[PDB]
Amino acid sequence: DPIKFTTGSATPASYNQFIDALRERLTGGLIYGIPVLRDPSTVEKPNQYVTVELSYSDTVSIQLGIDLTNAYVVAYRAGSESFFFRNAPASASTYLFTGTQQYSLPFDGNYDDLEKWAHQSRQRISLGLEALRQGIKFLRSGASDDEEIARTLIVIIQMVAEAARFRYVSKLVVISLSNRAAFQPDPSMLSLENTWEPLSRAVQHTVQDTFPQNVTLINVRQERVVVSSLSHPSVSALALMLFVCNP
Amino acid sequence: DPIKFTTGSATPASYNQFIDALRERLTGGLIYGIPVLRDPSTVEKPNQYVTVELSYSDTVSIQLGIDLTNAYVVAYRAGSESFFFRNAPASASTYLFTGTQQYSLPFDGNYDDLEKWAHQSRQRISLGLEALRQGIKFLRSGASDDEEIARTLIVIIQMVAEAARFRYVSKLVVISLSNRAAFQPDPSMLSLENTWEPLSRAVQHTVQDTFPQNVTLINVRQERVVVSSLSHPSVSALALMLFVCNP
Amino acid sequence: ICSSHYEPTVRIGGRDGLCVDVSDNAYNNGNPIILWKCKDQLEVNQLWTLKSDKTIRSKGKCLTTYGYAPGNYVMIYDCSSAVAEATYWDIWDNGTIINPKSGLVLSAESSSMGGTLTVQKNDYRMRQGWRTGNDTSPFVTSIAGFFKLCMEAHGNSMWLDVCDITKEEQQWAVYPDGSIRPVQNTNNCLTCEEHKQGATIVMMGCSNAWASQRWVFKSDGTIYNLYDDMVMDVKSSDPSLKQIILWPYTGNANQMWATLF
Amino acid sequence: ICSSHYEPTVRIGGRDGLCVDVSDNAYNNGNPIILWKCKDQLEVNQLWTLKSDKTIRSKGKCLTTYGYAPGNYVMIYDCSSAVAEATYWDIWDNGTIINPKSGLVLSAESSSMGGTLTVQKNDYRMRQGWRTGNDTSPFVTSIAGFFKLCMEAHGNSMWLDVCDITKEEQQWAVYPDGSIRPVQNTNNCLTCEEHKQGATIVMMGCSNAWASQRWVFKSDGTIYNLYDDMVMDVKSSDPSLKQIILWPYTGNANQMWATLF
Ligand SMILES: CC(=O)N[C@@H]1[C@@H](O)[C@H](O)[C@@H](CO)O[C@H]1O
Ligand SMILES: CC(=O)N[C@@H]1[C@@H](O)[C@H](O)[C@@H](CO)O[C@H]1O
Numbered sequence A, B: 001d002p003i004k005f006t007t008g009s010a011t012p013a014s015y016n017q018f019i020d021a022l023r024e025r026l027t028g029g030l031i032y033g034i035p036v037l038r039d040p041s042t043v044e045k046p047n048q049y050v051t052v053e054l055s056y057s058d059t060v061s062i063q064l065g066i067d068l069t070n071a072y073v074v075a076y077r078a079g080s081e082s083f084f085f086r087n088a089p090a091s092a093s094t095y096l097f098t099g100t101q102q103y104s105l106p107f108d109g110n111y112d113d114l115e116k117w118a119h120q121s122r123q124r125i126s127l128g129l130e131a132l133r134q135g136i137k138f139l140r141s142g143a144s145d146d147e148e149i150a151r152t153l154i155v156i157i158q159m160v161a162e163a164a165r166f167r168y169v170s171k172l173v174v175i176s177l178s179n180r181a182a183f184q185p186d187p188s189m190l191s192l193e194n195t196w197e198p199l200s201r202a203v204q205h206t207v208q209d210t211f212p213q214n215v216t217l218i219n220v221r222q223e224r225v226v227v228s229s230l231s232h233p234s235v236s237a238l239a240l241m242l243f244v245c246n247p
Numbered sequence C, D: 001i002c003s004s005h006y007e008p009t010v011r012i013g014g015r016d017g018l019c020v021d022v023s024d025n026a027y028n029n030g031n032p033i034i035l036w037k038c039k040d041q042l043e044v045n046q047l048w049t050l051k052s053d054k055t056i057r058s059k060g061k062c063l064t065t066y067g068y069a070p071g072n073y074v075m076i077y078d079c080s081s082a083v084a085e086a087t088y089w090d091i092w093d094n095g096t097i098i099n100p101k102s103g104l105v106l107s108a109e110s111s112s113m114g115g116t117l118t119v120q121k122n123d124y125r126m127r128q129g130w131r132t133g134n135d136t137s138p139f140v141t142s143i144a145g146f147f148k149l150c151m152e153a154h155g156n157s158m159w160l161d162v163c164d165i166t167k168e169e170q171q172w173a174v175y176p177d178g179s180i181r182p183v184q185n186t187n188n189c190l191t192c193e194e195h196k197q198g199a200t201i202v203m204m205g206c207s208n209a210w211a212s213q214r215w216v217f218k219s220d221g222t223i224y225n226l227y228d229d230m231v232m233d234v235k236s237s238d239p240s241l242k243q244i245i246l247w248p249y250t251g252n253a254n255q256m257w258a259t260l261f
């Protein structure tokens, strides 16, 4: 309910404390000394969602609906109205932001659909603090410009849900804050985003400290890093695994 | 030569001091208690350009070529290379960023061409500090992505040349800094940008404190403000007039 | 060298956002010039060509003082039959319409729509304030203070708060007469507690249409008052105080303002 | 419940980024297992299936200790003809390959390409370090420190500076053996001044392949050293000092690191 980042008074220190505290809530168990999420067959529907508050001023704040599952972001509430992605299931709608008026955005909540709607690839859309504060402000003053609602959603998910998963995304953010300059995700970040499931499953099937299928990442200079081992440095980039099986 | 904004250590105080000091250099005379630029028939070609430095770190900085005329931005230098718009005249090229290697961008330096190249209207492209520091960093680490070079040029021109002209653009910027949140220009800003020439000429032809042709602006809520008087509040938005005639 | 072939024709707004008007649309020499409602579309009895010769004309006749004594009325008179100098006028970039010879200035001296105009002494009254032409509507806008800061309006006084376009309290209407009025109660005007180096701008009744209610959005970036020769200033550059004060020009950040329309 | 039908087959990298190898591509029982150059494409004498039974196989024969005494060599032997327990192996998530019965661990004891492997006592030497499979290339990446901060490398020591992907000095190659090496002089390794609560990480010769040069990128976000049981830490959380020191785990921001590849 109250896991909230105040964007007013943000510091690198401040922002971390948050992401941590979130990973915390999402953290279902440990597998090989990596935080795995919960078995969706261990969680009941009324228990399934989490609420993150992003505040601008105070006044001025929007909530997010986080599936406990993923870790995905099913919905966001802006005042006495809330909005859900066109593929949230019936559960999100009945068990979340109740007491509000509930509308459905015309887009899925994967990227290749949000991008479709934003008319702009993930990699041209800039990330930073000022850009997130611009997002809270926007989404709050409820102006139906779908084109934007997508764009600004992309910003948030990344700087929050993707932040939760990859230690690599947390830093990139923290670096922006300390630098006070925006950044767009490089090949290295997009990989991690695009490869969370398959990497999650690798870690978990691991036997002689070896992945049974090579996970292939891309490094800043568009070269392939092909990871077959739990012992690999890169594997450390992963801070939150989707649950796939117990060993 | 050295009129430079350090973006490291930027404050509202800091940023102003700059814009001022620039308007200063551009300021050719006063007409009805408004700063007019110089008569392009009063300036010789070797005297025609100004250099603004935008620094990120130090290291890390790019220069701009400002026509003294407009007030326009003919070119920018990033290290031992400099780049000019495809419509800068022969003068900019011979008299500016000499001692450098000089290339030409494939775009005009009006907006409707930069926008064409950025695949994005002026009004979707966000402004702020972090976004300008992202721009300096980018343009400096010389990566030929025209699509971006346009986008990031649009940011700079606005936050610098448009800032110089309209007291309205300075504030919007200063508000971002103090707020630490990005903004996109509203109808009100785009107007002033799009109506600088015709408003400049109005002010100057003014007789009984009356414009001989009604200048028509747009206010935040897309309504028309139609200005026929030097005495109008709005007229105050203008901080720098292009020269059109002496009275 | 800006030519002056041009002779534009505009209506004229003023006290309370009313229009300068030819009574009933009648033109017989001598007919009083009144201050009516600004009619819906552009009629002749409200339009005024501002001629080269320095005369001001509706339907080809002249805007004319009856005589040169403060309290005499302006009327419509056929310009040739009219006394030469009594028909010349001069509009200042500061928004007053003076008559050269008389030294007197055009002013709207009563509340009523049916009010007549008069030449008066120049005291820079809100009522002596004017603003040409065509679009008479007050200028709805937000005044920005320092960094991050805008005038907000609470009942009677006004202070600064964080600029928010959502808030209504931050929205102002500047009227052709130079008054600034909160779009909430357009019957208030920003006013000086008194004509002192210290006041402390309050909100008061435009019933009065005083000198201390007529403001200039001057192009040095100050909000200026031509009777006091003083500007609007934010106490000790400390805004926690909820006080804005009339003070002489320094030019420091605290005295500077932006129309964020 | 993750099934274990799976039996993958990978090459194995290790000391100096070399490969585990079947000498000359010959398989006669008894033939020494060497540490050759990691051949261009994937040959059989370099590939290893990691079987369910806990044996490690190239071309169907077994990775085998000659005997259970520290300093005996590993060889290729036909697994059935081979002594049962001498052919079982265990790879730890910490990157060591132990032999259960012997308690000894696989290690590459000389510099030369032509080097033979041996079971040794487990001292967590850079030379006892290993990393499966297929892509043996060291992992070229930038290590990020605090906020805004990355390891930069100047000749012999190393400190933190502002993260810049342009700078070469901020680029590191992590090798299958667990060494961290500046892409400038890949003959250096990050090393502990000494095995003390205080050192002060320097850069030294990987000629040595010591315990104090083998680092773990551990998933709590620390850079850990399994012989010292201590991590890499930024003196008093003050970076002006140009000092990074081996210290016990606190978990504070100063001890945390990011691979920015
Ligand atoms: C055809 C294909 O895509 N398979 C790749 C292979 O090329 C690679 O050698 C191996 C380990 O690097 O990972 C596999 O998934
Ligand atoms: C046809 C046209 O665009 N002309 C406009 C007119 O509509 C308007 O009344 C006048 C003053 O408002 O300004 C003119 O330029």
Ligand SMILES: CC(=O)N[C@@H]1[C@@H](O)[C@H](O)[C@@H](CO)O[C@H]1O
Pocket (backbone or CB within 6 Å): B214, C008, C009, C010, C042, C047, C134
């Ligand atoms: C033709 C005519 O009488 N109409 C006038 C026009 O000429 C004038 O310029 C305008 C204000 O700019 O107001 C219109 O109503």
Ligand SMILES: CC(=O)N[C@@H]1[C@@H](O)[C@H](O)[C@@H](CO)O[C@H]1O
Pocket (backbone or CB within 6 Å): C092, C093, C094
């Ligand atoms: C130099 C001079 O004496 N000129 C004055 C000016 O200062 C005055 O305020 C202005 C319009 O308001 O008209 C003139 O009479």
Ligand SMILES: CC(=O)N[C@@H]1[C@@H](O)[C@H](O)[C@@H](CO)O[C@H]1O
Pocket (backbone or CB within 6 Å): A214, D008, D009, D010, D042, D047, D134
């Ligand atoms: C068919 C074969 O022998 N080739 C192997 C492949 O099966 C293995 O999985 C891969 C590492 O993942 O290395 C290849 O060279």
Ligand SMILES: CC(=O)N[C@@H]1[C@@H](O)[C@H](O)[C@@H](CO)O[C@H]1O
Pocket (backbone or CB within 6 Å): D092, D093, D094
């Ligand atoms: C609880 C226990 O004693 N298990 C140990 C573990 O702590 C050790 O470090 C690991 C791999 O390195 O293997 C086991 O022998």
